[PDB]
Amino acid sequence: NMDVIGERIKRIKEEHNSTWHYDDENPYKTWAYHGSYEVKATGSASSMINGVVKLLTKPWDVVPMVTQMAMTDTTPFGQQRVFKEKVDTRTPRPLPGTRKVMEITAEWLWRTLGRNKRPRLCTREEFTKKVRTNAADSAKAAVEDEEFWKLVDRERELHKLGKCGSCVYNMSRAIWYMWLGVRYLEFEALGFLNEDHWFSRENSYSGVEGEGLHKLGYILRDISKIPGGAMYADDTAGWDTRITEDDLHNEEKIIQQMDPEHRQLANAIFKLTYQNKVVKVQRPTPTGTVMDIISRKDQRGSGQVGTYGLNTFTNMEAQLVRQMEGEGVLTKADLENPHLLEKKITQWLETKGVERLKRMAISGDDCVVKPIDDRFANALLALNDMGKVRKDIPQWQPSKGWHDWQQVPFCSHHFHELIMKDGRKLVVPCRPQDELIGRARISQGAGWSLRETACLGKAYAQMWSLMYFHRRDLRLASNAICSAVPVHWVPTSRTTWSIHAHHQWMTTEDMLTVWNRVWIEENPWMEDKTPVTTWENVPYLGKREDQWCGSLIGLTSRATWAQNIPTAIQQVRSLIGNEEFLDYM
Ligand SMILES: COc1ccc(CC(=O)O)cc1-c1ccsc1
Ligand SMILES: [Zn+2]
Ligand SMILES: [Zn+2]
């Protein structure tokens, strides 16, 4: 395997020849270990607390989930722990018949996805514009430097020769240039999947790319109208670690639809950075901290450009295979059979495939499936055999589905149908409230001024106004944060990296105006475009639902907090200084 990965290791070895060594106490069992070199410790044992959000959410100072989120270890100790538990495993190879069905389904799926769109290369200017409209950091400085682009051209020339020299995945200025350059090249060859929305619902049927969190609930409610069995939402245990060599070969089939110049570069990403990979991971030792150089031929690199799209692809494929087994199209004998008859698989795909894709909502490893009946609950032979073993359940125990789309978990949320005072219905996203408060209380990094902290707090408050306004405690805390932070201060940083986040809260525009735009004007499931003129007409969950989902409403500590909130707002204001503030209470 050194013929593909050798050059990359050689450059790492030569760059760190001062401290390069083969550690014999290295813990890698399924990854090939190449060597180590000394580094300085990266990450922290805990996370920095947002004092603005914390001062305005006092009742949650005594909440266990809120305290757990304040932790999260990112040190070389924390890295090694998660690695041992998840990453250092081997997925048994699927059976010959399973491999055949997967190949037939992948070919059909790629042709269906490419029926209107044609693959294309992504550019230097697209990558630049994206980096620009994100930070405005060191990534924007590299994009601005012509010497970074000349390193890109040189690595590209190697890729055209079927070689790689610096595309290394990470679990001072030269190494940063090689990392960003590796990501640019991946984006150039596979970025079209994201940039041209191959996984939009109109293009993929099952996909939800570009839809946004506030649209996911409406999609689940539309799926519920399709005749069939229950709605299933099974969680795979560590999806990225279950991506097999057979999955990678099926994913690669997209190169068949590419122009010759694009195919060569995409083939280079697939063969050299997906099907072979060189990975850097930190590790503590009695001597200090080391960086290990490891490699393998399968699994998915979590941080890559193609990750979301290719996980969505393989999960759509895997769920269609499970649907076929549920329908009796695929038997136990079929999966073991190398000479499995292609005809009934092709017939099912050509006659039912698209209708079956419409019964699903698939976002990377997250899936919701409404099969034609409940035989799907016990259709586990292919799912387990493909390596997509469900999390925290015996392997052969039937899946439990839901007969109400409002109970279905999808993308860390569930969704409620609300009735507004004017009789119109809204479908809103929701999750346990402690997870929302616990996240907002976290500031990312260190050395942040009260202004930056207050502005991130404002971002969280405004996200709650737009997505979670239906939670009494979050509307109150949101109003308190926005009252404590100067009106003209622009929310900074980000509340989430989710593909489902459109960041409509990253503004100084009136939140009720933005609310109306999102939930009324631009909402395709809102036939009546009558604007809501007051927050008084913006609904809450029913009190019992709010409580079932974590509200502290009805508690004394909460009644005391609500009563005394103008005092805490005033305290934050007095520390921020002589700025313009608006009272939202
Ligand atoms: C499906 O949308 C999500 C999924 C998870 C998360 C949590 C996180 O990324 O910290 C946030 C969102 C989200 C998206 C728009 S507002 C909040
Ligand atoms: Zn490379
Ligand atoms: Zn809820």
Side-chain angles (χ1 to χ4, degrees), residues 8 155 159 163-167 185 272-273:
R8 271 171 283 192
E155 190 55 30
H159 286 193
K163 295 168 204 152
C164 188
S166 59
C167 301
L185 288 180
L272 314 168
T273 83

PDB file of all heavy atoms in Angstrom, residues 8 155 159 163-167 182 185 272-273, ligand 2, unseen atoms left out:
ATOM      1  N   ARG A   8       3.516  10.993   0.866  1.00  0.00           N
ATOM      2  CA  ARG A   8       2.951  11.811   1.947  1.00  0.00           C
ATOM      3  C   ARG A   8       3.678  11.590   3.265  1.00  0.00           C
ATOM      4  O   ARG A   8       4.001  12.570   3.930  1.00  0.00           O
ATOM      5  CB  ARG A   8       1.466  11.513   2.121  1.00  0.00           C
ATOM      6  CG  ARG A   8       0.563  12.369   1.260  1.00  0.00           C
ATOM      7  CD  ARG A   8      -0.849  11.848   1.338  1.00  0.00           C
ATOM      8  NE  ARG A   8      -1.012  10.654   0.512  1.00  0.00           N
ATOM      9  CZ  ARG A   8      -2.184  10.118   0.203  1.00  0.00           C
ATOM     10  NH1 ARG A   8      -3.309  10.655   0.659  1.00  0.00           N
ATOM     11  NH2 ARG A   8      -2.242   9.052  -0.581  1.00  0.00           N
ATOM     12  N   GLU A 155       0.296  20.341  -6.348  1.00  0.00           N
ATOM     13  CA  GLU A 155      -0.357  19.126  -5.849  1.00  0.00           C
ATOM     14  C   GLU A 155      -1.299  18.567  -6.924  1.00  0.00           C
ATOM     15  O   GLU A 155      -1.243  17.369  -7.203  1.00  0.00           O
ATOM     16  CB  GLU A 155      -1.067  19.366  -4.498  1.00  0.00           C
ATOM     17  CG  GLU A 155      -1.555  18.084  -3.802  1.00  0.00           C
ATOM     18  CD  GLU A 155      -0.533  16.996  -3.537  1.00  0.00           C
ATOM     19  OE1 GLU A 155       0.660  17.314  -3.340  1.00  0.00           O
ATOM     20  OE2 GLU A 155      -0.929  15.813  -3.527  1.00  0.00           O
ATOM     21  N   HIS A 159      -1.717  14.799  -8.714  1.00  0.00           N
ATOM     22  CA  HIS A 159      -3.000  14.083  -8.839  1.00  0.00           C
ATOM     23  C   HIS A 159      -3.260  13.622 -10.267  1.00  0.00           C
ATOM     24  O   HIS A 159      -3.742  12.500 -10.473  1.00  0.00           O
ATOM     25  CB  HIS A 159      -4.162  14.944  -8.330  1.00  0.00           C
ATOM     26  CG  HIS A 159      -4.223  15.080  -6.835  1.00  0.00           C
ATOM     27  ND1 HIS A 159      -5.342  15.593  -6.209  1.00  0.00           N
ATOM     28  CD2 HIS A 159      -3.293  14.793  -5.896  1.00  0.00           C
ATOM     29  CE1 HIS A 159      -5.052  15.613  -4.917  1.00  0.00           C
ATOM     30  NE2 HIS A 159      -3.841  15.114  -4.682  1.00  0.00           N
ATOM     31  N   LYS A 163      -0.608  10.550  -8.327  1.00  0.00           N
ATOM     32  CA  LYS A 163       0.226  10.649  -7.125  1.00  0.00           C
ATOM     33  C   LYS A 163      -0.319  11.694  -6.176  1.00  0.00           C
ATOM     34  O   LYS A 163      -1.087  12.567  -6.582  1.00  0.00           O
ATOM     35  CB  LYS A 163       1.687  11.010  -7.499  1.00  0.00           C
ATOM     36  CG  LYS A 163       2.411   9.943  -8.321  1.00  0.00           C
ATOM     37  CD  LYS A 163       3.717  10.479  -8.905  1.00  0.00           C
ATOM     38  CE  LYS A 163       4.146   9.716 -10.136  1.00  0.00           C
ATOM     39  NZ  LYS A 163       4.963  10.555 -11.062  1.00  0.00           N
ATOM     40  N   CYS A 164       0.095  11.618  -4.910  1.00  0.00           N
ATOM     41  CA  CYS A 164      -0.297  12.566  -3.878  1.00  0.00           C
ATOM     42  C   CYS A 164       0.919  12.839  -2.994  1.00  0.00           C
ATOM     43  O   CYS A 164       1.651  11.904  -2.660  1.00  0.00           O
ATOM     44  CB  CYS A 164      -1.470  12.018  -3.062  1.00  0.00           C
ATOM     45  SG  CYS A 164      -2.186  13.214  -1.907  1.00  0.00           S
ATOM     46  N   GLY A 165       1.117  14.090  -2.606  1.00  0.00           N
ATOM     47  CA  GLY A 165       2.258  14.441  -1.770  1.00  0.00           C
ATOM     48  C   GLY A 165       1.963  15.139  -0.457  1.00  0.00           C
ATOM     49  O   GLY A 165       2.771  15.063   0.469  1.00  0.00           O
ATOM     50  N   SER A 166       0.813  15.810  -0.345  1.00  0.00           N
ATOM     51  CA  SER A 166       0.490  16.567   0.863  1.00  0.00           C
ATOM     52  C   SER A 166      -0.964  16.512   1.343  1.00  0.00           C
ATOM     53  O   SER A 166      -1.327  17.322   2.202  1.00  0.00           O
ATOM     54  CB  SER A 166       0.889  18.027   0.655  1.00  0.00           C
ATOM     55  OG  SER A 166       0.201  18.588  -0.453  1.00  0.00           O
ATOM     56  N   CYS A 167      -1.816  15.627   0.784  1.00  0.00           N
ATOM     57  CA  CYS A 167      -3.229  15.590   1.213  1.00  0.00           C
ATOM     58  C   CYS A 167      -3.383  14.683   2.410  1.00  0.00           C
ATOM     59  O   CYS A 167      -3.483  13.469   2.275  1.00  0.00           O
ATOM     60  CB  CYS A 167      -4.166  15.217   0.065  1.00  0.00           C
ATOM     61  SG  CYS A 167      -4.089  16.362  -1.342  1.00  0.00           S
ATOM     62  N   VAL A 182      -5.429  20.713   0.292  1.00  0.00           N
ATOM     63  CA  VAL A 182      -6.023  19.374   0.218  1.00  0.00           C
ATOM     64  C   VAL A 182      -7.542  19.521   0.166  1.00  0.00           C
ATOM     65  O   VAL A 182      -8.181  18.893  -0.673  1.00  0.00           O
ATOM     66  CB  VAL A 182      -5.594  18.482   1.402  1.00  0.00           C
ATOM     67  N   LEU A 185      -8.651  21.052  -3.310  1.00  0.00           N
ATOM     68  CA  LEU A 185      -8.619  20.048  -4.372  1.00  0.00           C
ATOM     69  C   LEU A 185      -9.797  19.085  -4.292  1.00  0.00           C
ATOM     70  O   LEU A 185     -10.377  18.714  -5.320  1.00  0.00           O
ATOM     71  CB  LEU A 185      -7.278  19.295  -4.383  1.00  0.00           C
ATOM     72  CG  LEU A 185      -6.042  20.093  -4.888  1.00  0.00           C
ATOM     73  CD1 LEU A 185      -4.827  19.245  -4.850  1.00  0.00           C
ATOM     74  CD2 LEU A 185      -6.241  20.656  -6.286  1.00  0.00           C
ATOM     75  N   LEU A 272      -6.846   8.180  -3.976  1.00  0.00           N
ATOM     76  CA  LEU A 272      -5.734   8.620  -3.130  1.00  0.00           C
ATOM     77  C   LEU A 272      -6.092   9.211  -1.774  1.00  0.00           C
ATOM     78  O   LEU A 272      -5.240   9.183  -0.883  1.00  0.00           O
ATOM     79  CB  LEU A 272      -4.838   9.638  -3.901  1.00  0.00           C
ATOM     80  CG  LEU A 272      -4.420   9.312  -5.352  1.00  0.00           C
ATOM     81  CD1 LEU A 272      -3.800  10.543  -6.028  1.00  0.00           C
ATOM     82  CD2 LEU A 272      -3.454   8.149  -5.417  1.00  0.00           C
ATOM     83  N   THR A 273      -7.292   9.796  -1.605  1.00  0.00           N
ATOM     84  CA  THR A 273      -7.628  10.425  -0.313  1.00  0.00           C
ATOM     85  C   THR A 273      -8.862   9.786   0.380  1.00  0.00           C
ATOM     86  O   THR A 273      -9.073  10.040   1.566  1.00  0.00           O
ATOM     87  CB  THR A 273      -7.748  11.964  -0.433  1.00  0.00           C
ATOM     88  OG1 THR A 273      -9.035  12.341  -0.913  1.00  0.00           O
ATOM     89  CG2 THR A 273      -6.635  12.594  -1.292  1.00  0.00           C
TER      90      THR A 273
HETATM   91 ZN    ZN B   2      -2.869  15.193  -2.781  1.00  0.00          ZN
END
